[PDB]
């Protein structure tokens, strides 16, 4: 689950991935099944939203036992893994996965062409805000991070629902495509560590245990300020039950098009699978992707 030790039980079962991928919680027909679990487990719906410190002594004692009698029927048996826990004395436990979320959420929040580089100095100066927090002396800097992490995956979960009702997915013959143009809080999505958060929530959503196909996604968000259109090519996955490791093609076949018309594109990243493009250049560029398909 995401952040058990610093949030409640119920608020971790929403904003997860391998629970959302198997119960389809974005609709209404799946949210009835979630309370149907806590009936069997013997947990009231007042206790299950208290934060994880103030739960009873005889429930956190018995969490390793209830998670194996009642978790089989809903398919969630790939939940219990083995992880690491670092306690510094009287402070309290923080696992390994619950630390890397507090560093992926301290790297973009909590701080024409010269409007661009005034953003890139807001990321480079944000880098030392996690470099200090990695140590063991400053814990008042870490607990700013966790309460900046839950308001990241509450703004993603309220966008990723609003796609899967309107169904803005084109189901084309080579890949799948989504283009987001309007909604709330579209300022957040200029960081490449924010699109890969939402795109990782869509890949494990639709390319799920249920066999429909196996096709790549292409995302494209937008803001104002010369209409940047940060597009990003993604990859497909398997539902954890590992033979094909190549799994990417958007470096080569994309690169041929940008040397064909070079219509207002900049390759300005460590990665070759995310660029910007002007607003007038989106429509003739995407048609060329369907041509010369290398997949």
């Amino acid at each position: 689950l995401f952040l058990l030790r610093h949030s409640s039980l119920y608020d971790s079962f929403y904003y997860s991935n391998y629970v959302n991928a198997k119960l389809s919680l974005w609709n209404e027909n799946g949210k009835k099944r979630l309370h149907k679990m806590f009936a069997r487990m013997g947990i009231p719906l007042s206790t299950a939203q208290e934060t994880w410190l103030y739960m009873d002594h005889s429930i956190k004692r018995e969490l390793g036992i209830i998670f194996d009698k009642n978790l089989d029927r809903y398919g969630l048996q790939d939940i219990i893994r083995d992880g690491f826990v670092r306690t510094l004395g009287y402070r309290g436990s923080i696992s390994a996965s619950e630390f890397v979320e507090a560093l992926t959420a301290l790297l973009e929040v909590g701080n024409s062409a010269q409007k661009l580089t005034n953003l890139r100095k807001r990321w480079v100066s944000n880098f030392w805000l996690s470099w200090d927090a990695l140590d063991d002396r400053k814990v008042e800097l870490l607990n700013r991070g966790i309460q900046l992490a839950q308001d990241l995956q509450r703004a993603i979960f309220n966008t990723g629902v609003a796609i899967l009702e309107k169904k803005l997915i084109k189901h084309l013959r080579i890949y799948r495509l989504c283009v987001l143009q309007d909604g709330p809080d579209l300022d957040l999505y200029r960081n490449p560590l924010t699109l890969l958060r939402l795109g990782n929530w869509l890949i494990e959503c639709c390319a799920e245990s249920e066999d429909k196909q196996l096709l790549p996604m292409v995302l494209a968000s937008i803001d104002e300020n010369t209409d940047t259109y940060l597009v990003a090519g993604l990859t497909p996955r398997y539902p954890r039950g590992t033979k094909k490791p190549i799994l990417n093609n958007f470096s080569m076949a994309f690169q041929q098009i940008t040397a064909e018309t070079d219509a207002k594109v900049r390759i300005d990243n460590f990665e070759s699978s995310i660029i910007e493009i002007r607003r007038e250049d989106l429509s003739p560029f995407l048609e060329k992707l369907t041509l010369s398909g290398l997949l």
Partner: protein
Amino acid sequence: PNVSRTIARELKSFLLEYTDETGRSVYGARIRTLGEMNSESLEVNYRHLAESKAILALFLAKCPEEMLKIFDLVAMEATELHYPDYARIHSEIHVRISDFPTIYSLRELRESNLSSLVRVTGVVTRRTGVFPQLKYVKFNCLKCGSILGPFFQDSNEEIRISFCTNCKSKGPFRVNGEKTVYRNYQRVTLQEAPGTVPPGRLPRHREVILLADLVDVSKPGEEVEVTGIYKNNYDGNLNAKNGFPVFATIIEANSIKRRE
């Protein structure tokens, strides 16, 4: 009586094996709606029970004060085959009997409708605040121990259970504030609807007790339809009137419906 064990096994088949309209037994798909709202209230219609067994339909109108206890006690073990870890969430279910057309407007209440399931409409006038009730009289005996076992004074009766020969003799008992189960309480009165009045006569009041689930379901000015029972409340019934032994009558509510 001791015939109740024959009743317990034979209405249980009308929580599981009563089906209608091509499957989907409506009281197997009802207990799954408990839990996911977590609400300790089974809805039970009266037409869906009277068509099957006409014996128990008579034993609701005769004496539901002892009938509904057995109808609650086996109602726990219907859910327990679905949700086996349900002893710790309220540990109790009470039931919600639906329509039974006895009394027309308000004023047909004679002796012949005593201690029986009555259905009556009206208009909420005024209501008090929400309070706790005892529900578990636990003594403060000085000779015995101050746990002393659970004893029940759960009515409008306030039982005069005197403590005699507890440990060695009659220890003096009080009440403490320890480990008992309180429950909610709210009295709301009700008067006659202005559409179905006879000509000339003033409307009449009556006091209704709500209990433990149905508090904050009314709002003053609603056409409410009460399906309570009808009893004979003591404890101060016309204290200045002992030459006329005249008793006070309060409807204890069992369900609440809105306007329809």
